């Protein structure tokens, strides 16, 4: 049935997968042992867990995910953890040498050594599942592993499976803050692969997360844990009608079908709400209209771009929790007449109604409070194209004198690929420009 396989590449992908799996096990009452030891007091768990977990003959739950990374340090860090008894060691493939923010080695001299193993693993996992709809590929653009390895693996997954959905989730390097220096070097080559060989791609940065946490959550010393928690909440909200049901079931195919207006424009704008702390969820009346209006605010977007600079073409609308259709209709009526929000003169309306009976849960030790209902939006607009513009400008200014390119030449690549990626990105920016232009 509605069963999917998750792919986790690099340190960020592995930790995001860990956060998602722990969120699923806590929200479904799945104990870390892999059994149902609660024989005295039950607290839930009688649901459809086959979507992500698997049921054995002995009552064991086996995760269905791909935990691959080059550096054995991350594998060891997770292995010495408290959830080592849940997954299997064969799912966590170590490595001798790593890329560590490089596409050259990780795409040619490191990537092509471990191929048959991961292909056999994923083939076995797919054979272990009955219904397959899409994949959850978790990687990053800054990380050399999650760029070269992600690209080389997806170039084979897209060709061994053309009828299956190929999603994408990674981190977009922020123009203001950055971790490394060679991030655009990998991004300029990963973007071509994710555009000309994938159906959809989701971009997020960390600076917007920092701004929203310091603004709403009011934290002075943040950490990766909250960043992972937010992404896990977003992923759970997106795939909410797969594990459970609702008034209008909202699956993967139905929204990715409409979330893609053109083969070249498949880069939506996610926004999770409400993103608040415990004290911010007590004396605050929460309805549907206010949060939906808050969803379109630039401050709440995880991508630093002003929506007023462009206009929307397609919007995907989702909900999670006790939501009433009348509130949704009132919010739609309010937003359709809002002059601040801009849209094309050819799409008067477009959105989805995902009514999800199960309310979002909480975690002991997290920051998210108990909210009666959640909401997630996936809109498409041309105002986000500035990030690609800045990326191209940076690549141009850092390619004129060929900074840190002799290393890639010695490792082995064609220098023309840089010009090829540059012209492809230029063409994509052009296409976005003409699409944004009305009559």
């Amino acid at each position: 049935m509605r069963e999917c396989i998750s792919i986790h590449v690099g340190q960020a992908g592995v930790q995001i997968g860990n956060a998602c799996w722990e969120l699923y096990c806590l929200e479904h009452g799945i104990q870390p042992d892999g059994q149902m030891p609660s024989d005295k007091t039950i607290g839930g768990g009688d649901d459809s867990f086959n979507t992500f977990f698997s049921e054995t003959g002995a009552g064991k739950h086996v995760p269905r995910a791909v935990f691959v990374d080059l550096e054995p340090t991350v594998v060891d860090e997770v292995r010495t953890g408290t959830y080592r008894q849940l997954f299997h060691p064969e799912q966590l493939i170590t490595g001798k040498e790593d890329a560590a923010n490089n596409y050259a080695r990780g795409h040619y001299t490191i990537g092509k050594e471990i191929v048959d193993l991961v292909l056999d693993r994923i083939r076995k996992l797919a054979d272990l599942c009955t219904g397959l709809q899409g994949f959850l590929i978790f990687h990053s653009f800054g990380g050399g592993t999650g760029s070269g390895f992600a690209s080389l693996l997806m170039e084979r997954l897209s060709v061994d499976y053309g009828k299956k959905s190929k999603l994408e989730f990674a981190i977009y390097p922020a123009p203001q803050v950055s971790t490394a220096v060679v991030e655009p070097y990998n991004s300029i080559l990963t973007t071509h692969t994710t555009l000309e060989h994938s159906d959809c791609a989701f971009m997020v940065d960390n600076e917007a997360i920092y701004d929203i946490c310091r603004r709403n959550l009011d934290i002075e010393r943040p950490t990766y844990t909250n960043l992972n928690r937010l992404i896990g909440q977003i992923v759970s909200s997106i795939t909410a009608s797969l594990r459970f049901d609702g008034a209008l079931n909202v699956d993967l195919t139905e929204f990715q079908t409409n979330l893609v207006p053109y083969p070249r424009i498949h880069f939506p704008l996610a926004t999770y709400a409400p993103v608040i702390s415990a004290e911010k969820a007590y004396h605050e009346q929460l309805s549907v209209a206010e949060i939906t209006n808050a969803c379109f605010e630039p401050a709440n977007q995880m991508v630093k771009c002003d929506p007023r600079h462009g206009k929307y073409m397609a919007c995907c609308m989702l909900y999670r929790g006790d939501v009433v259709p009348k509130d949704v209709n009132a919010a739609i009526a309010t937003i359709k007449t809002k002059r601040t929000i801009q849209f094309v003169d050819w799409c008067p309306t477009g959105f989805k109604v995902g009514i999800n009976y199960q309310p979002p849960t909480v975690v002991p030790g997290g920051d998210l409070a108990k909210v009666q209902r959640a909401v997630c939006m996936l809109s498409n607009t041309t105002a986000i194209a500035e990030a690609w513009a800045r990326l191209d400008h940076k690549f141009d200014l850092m390619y004129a004198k060929r900074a840190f390119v002799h290393w890639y030449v010695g490792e082995g690549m064609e220098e023309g690929e840089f010009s090829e990626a540059r012209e492809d990105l230029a063409a994509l920016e052009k296409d976005y420009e003409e699409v944004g232009v009305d009559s």
Binding site: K311, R339, Q342, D345, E433, V437, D438
Partner: peptide, 29 residues
């Protein structure tokens, strides 16, 4: 950029067009 500036001028023309569109919408209302 020169190209940019020009493209920015085109964006300004498009914004003027959209403002005219909004004027038309208000008239309709």
């Amino acid at each position: 950029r020169a190209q940019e500036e020009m493209q920015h001028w085109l964006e300004l023309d498009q914004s003027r067009e959209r403002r005219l569109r909004a004027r038309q919408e208000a008239n309709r209302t």
